[PDB]
Amino acid sequence: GPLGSGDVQVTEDAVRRYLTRKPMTTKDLLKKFQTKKTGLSSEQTVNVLAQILKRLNPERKMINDKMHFSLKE
């Protein structure tokens, strides 16, 4: 985030904030949750993101022939 701000926890609330702004892939979301901020490894981060997305069940939107998740429209 600006000036090195960025999420320090990987949560449903944080994912919801991003997916309500624009559709995003899993790769796109992972970029928002950086080890330098959270202290979680890439494996730990992808695993809890998977849990969050399974629960949230956001709408799938196909963009560039790739599934994106969206909480907008």
Binding region for Zn ion (CB under 5 A): 63
Residue nearest to Zn ion (CB): 63
Q: Looking at this protein, which amino acid is placed at residue 26? A: T
Angle, CA 42 vertex, CA 56 and CA 39 arms, to 5°: 95
Nearest approach, Cβ of residue 23 and Zn ion (Å):
7
Q: Looking at beta carbons only, is 25 or 44 nearer to Zn ion?
A: 25
Nearest approach, Cβ of residue 30 and Zn ion (Å):
13
Closest CA to 70 of 11, 14, 20, 12: 20
Ligand-binding site membership of 68 (annotated): yes
Q: Looking at this protein, which amino acid is placed at residue 66? A: K
Ligand-binding site membership of 73 (annotated): yes
